[PDB]
Amino acid sequence: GPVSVANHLGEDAGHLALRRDVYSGLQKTPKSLPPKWFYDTVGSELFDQITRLPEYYPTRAEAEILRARSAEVASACRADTLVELGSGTSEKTRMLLDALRHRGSLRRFVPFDVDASVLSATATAIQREYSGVEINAVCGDFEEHLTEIPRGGRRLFVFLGSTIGNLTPGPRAQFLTALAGVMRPGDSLLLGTDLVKDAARLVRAYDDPGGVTAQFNRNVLAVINRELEADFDVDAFQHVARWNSAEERIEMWLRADGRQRVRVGALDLTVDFDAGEEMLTEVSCKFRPQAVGAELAAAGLHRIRWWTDEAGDFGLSLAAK
Ligand SMILES: Nc1nccc(-c2cccnc2)n1
Numbered sequence: 001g002p003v004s005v006a007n008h009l010g011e012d013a014g015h016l017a018l019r020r021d022v023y024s025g026l027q028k029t030p031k032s033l034p035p036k037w038f039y040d041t042v043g044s045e046l047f048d049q050i051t052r053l054p055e056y057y058p059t060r061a062e063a064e065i066l067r068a069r070s071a072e073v074a075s076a077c078r079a080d081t082l083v084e085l086g087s088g089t090s091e092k093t094r095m096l097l098d099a100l101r102h103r104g105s106l107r108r109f110v111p112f113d114v115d116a117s118v119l120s121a122t123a124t125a126i127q128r129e130y131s132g133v134e135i136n137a138v139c140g141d142f143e144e145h146l147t148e149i150p151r152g153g154r155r156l157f158v159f160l161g162s163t164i165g166n167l168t169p170g171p172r173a174q175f176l177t178a179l180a181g182v183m184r185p186g187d188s189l190l191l192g193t194d195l196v197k198d199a200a201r202l203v204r205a206y207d208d209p210g211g212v213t214a215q216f217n218r219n220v221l222a223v224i225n226r227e228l229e230a231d232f233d234v235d236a237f238q239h240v241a242r243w244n245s246a247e248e249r250i251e252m253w254l255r256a257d258g259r260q261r262v263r264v265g266a267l268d269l270t271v272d273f274d275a276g277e278e279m280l281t282e283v284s285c286k287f288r289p290q291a292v293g294a295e296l297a298a299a300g301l302h303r304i305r306w307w308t309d310e311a312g313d314f315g316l317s318l319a320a321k
Pocket of ligand 1: 205213282
């Protein structure tokens with residue numbers, strides 16, 4: 001099938017987004033950064049290692065559900081088009097593409113992400129593995145370009161890995177409302193959500209003893225150093241995984257070991273870290289089964305299927321427009 005890539009992000013979209021977030025984030029109290037910047041080449045390779053850590057259950061848990069329920073997803077949604085809010089690189093991507101193809105229904109694939117070079121590689125890869133599927137990759141962001149996702153056919157939107165968990169309730173509901181807005185009656189959404197559980201298990205999942213997640217978090221300081229001429233003493237910042245009991249969410253912090261004076265060159269900004277000051281780099285909200293259905297209902301979608309893994313660690317929702 002023919003490959004297409006439509007690019008809606010300017011060449012300096014990423015850099016200009018990084019200046020904004022760093023300028024604003026390092027002047028908040030407490031200092032905070034979007035989890036958007038962990039993923040340069042190094043961080044992406046670190047995340048790949050994280051998914052194979054025994055402590056990080058979500059990847060395997062979601063995969064377990066998908067290995068069992070992918071056929072039912074295909075037959076219940078009846079989609080001919082797979083829209084992935086992601087890079088299209090996971091084996092989970094293929095599991096759903098196989099399930100739709102097995103029904104003789106796989107007609108189009110739409111990967112949607114911000115890295116045009118990632119989408120181009122995904123599209124070439126799906127093109128050799130799935131004869132007869134048109135691949136329409138869309139380079140855009142959630143805030144502006146959900147409308148640029150092609151229309152027509154019966155579309156199954158996919159958003160896995162409890163990545164919606166990286167949005168706080170306010171921004172999370174806006175995203176779901178906007179996503180439901182571009183969905184057509186008959187379209188469906190498959191959404192993965194990590195579930196609330198034993199706190200010690202959750203903290204361990206975000207601070208493996210080998211420190212891969214620690215390096216992954218500290219990697220954000222190198223990215224700021226390299227891209228905006230900052231002088232973060234990366235080794236003087238400790239990764240700290242916190243369980244927020246009141247908000248029921250995991251929080252990734254970076255703790256300054258001693259007073260730090262950090263100058264971000266490209267921004268003409270100097271910020272100060274008190275000794276023991278912590279900066280928030282990510283939130284990872286954990287969900288309750290009932291609450292996910294209410295959130296989809298609040299945005300205008302109707303959950304028709306809910307699945308957990310065998311241990312009840314992770315949940316998958318199939319909601320219809
Ligand atoms: N996308 C996503 N969703 C949930 C958790 C995570 C995550 C972050 C940082 C380290 N390990 C896992 N990423």
